Design a protein around this ligand. Structure first.
Ligand SMILES: O=c1ccn(-c2cccc(OC(F)(F)F)c2)nc1-c1ccnn1-c1ccnc2ccccc12
Ligand SMILES: [Cl-]
Ligand SMILES: [Mg+2]
Ligand SMILES: [Zn+2]
Length: 313
């Protein structure tokens, strides 16, 4: 109760910035997450012993894959922390509780394969859930862990408050299905432009949280260039493995996933920044002005990828 968490000076200052990198020391990541919960939510909202037990079981249920791993989980939670800390008064007690937990759990039990590969393999999860296949599985893993003995971090909520926070978490996790993002950002764009966007309309709040979840999930494109460039290597390691598994099924993979088309990656990143990342952080900055540093850092990285194409690096 009087047991605060403190980081070394450089981490204490840098963790407040959007472009923070959590570093290569795995054993510090739980303490970084508890620090962010205490400052973002309060020291009183979770029982420390239960929270620590929950974090360690979540960690155990992430796999040893190049990108969709425990480090990505904590990185996405830190970006949500930065957004919540820069938009202090906009979010309820329950949303702050649920959104950091949702980010930590959003890729639980990921094996580095897209919803597409699961459908073509005819994976059992694809029969259980036809759409947002991996995202419904991630939410299912979250409920499993929340139901282990001594793991109910929401124990002091009433049943109706418990049901609300699990519904925040479910929608937040489903929203990380990038297939759903395109329509979501389009609708938010229209609502914003015609001035109909209303943060008191729960169905409008849901869309904005959805867009926050996309922004946090993509946040590797908003780091300083050296971090962004090295993360791209881990992203494409997974893509190329899926490409190999497509060829085993007797299917030519899309060029993004083909390791023979490695030369096409720089122009591939241009496309992703122009089609996905720039619009995402552009629409998010319109709705939440203090997230502008995410758009700025994203543009800086787009400019770095153009230098790669032009042989300036
Ligand atoms: O660098 C990239 C290049 C291509 N794609 C990508 C991923 C899925 C679909 C896609 O096609 C389309 F846009 F048409 F939808 C493109 N994503 C990234 C990327 C940047 C940061 N995260 N991230 C992600 C990498 C891998 N999986 C992710 C899943 C969800 C969100 C983000 C993901
Ligand atoms: Cl605060
Ligand atoms: Mg995911
Ligand atoms: Zn993710």
């Amino acid at each position: 109760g009087l047991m605060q968490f403190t980081l070394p000076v450089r981490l204490c200052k840098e963790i407040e910035l959007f472009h923070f990198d959590i570093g290569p020391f795995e054993n510090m990541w739980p303490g970084i997450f508890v620090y962010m919960v205490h400052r973002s939510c309060g020291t009183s909202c979770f029982e420390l012993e239960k929270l620590c037990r929950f974090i360690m079981s979540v960690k155990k249920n992430y796999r040893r894959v190049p990108y969709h791993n425990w480090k990505h989980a904590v990185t996405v939670a830190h970006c949500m922390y930065a957004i919540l800390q820069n938009n202090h008064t906009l979010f309820t007690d329950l949303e702050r509780k649920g959104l950091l937990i949702a980010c930590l759990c959003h890729d639980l039990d990921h094996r580095g394969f897209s919803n597409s590969y699961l459908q073509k393999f005819d994976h059992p999860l694809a029969a259980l859930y036809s759409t947002s296949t991996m995202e419904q599985h991630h939410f299912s893993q979250t409920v499993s862990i929340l139901q282990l003995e001594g793991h109910n971090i929401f124990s002091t909520l009433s049943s109706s408050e418990y049901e609300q926070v699990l519904e925040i978490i479910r929608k937040a996790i489903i929203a990380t299905d990038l297939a759903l993002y395109f329509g979501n950002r389009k609708q938010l764009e229209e609502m914003y432009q015609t001035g109909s966007l209303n943060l008191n309309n729960q169905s409008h709040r849901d869309r904005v949280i959805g867009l926050m979840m996309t922004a946090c999930d993509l946040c590797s494109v908003t780091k300083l260039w050296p971090v962004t460039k090295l993360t791209a290597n881990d992203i494409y390691a997974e893509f190329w493995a899926e490409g190999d598994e497509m060829k085993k099924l007797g299917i030519q993979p899309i060029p993004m996933m083909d390791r023979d088309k490695k030369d096409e990656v720089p122009q591939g990143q241009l496309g992703f920044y122009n089609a996905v990342a720039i619009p995402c952080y552009t629409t998010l900055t319109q709705i939440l002005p203090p997230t502008e540093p995410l758009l700025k850092a994203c543009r800086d990285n787009l400019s770095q990828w153009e230098k790669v194409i032009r042989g300036e690096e």
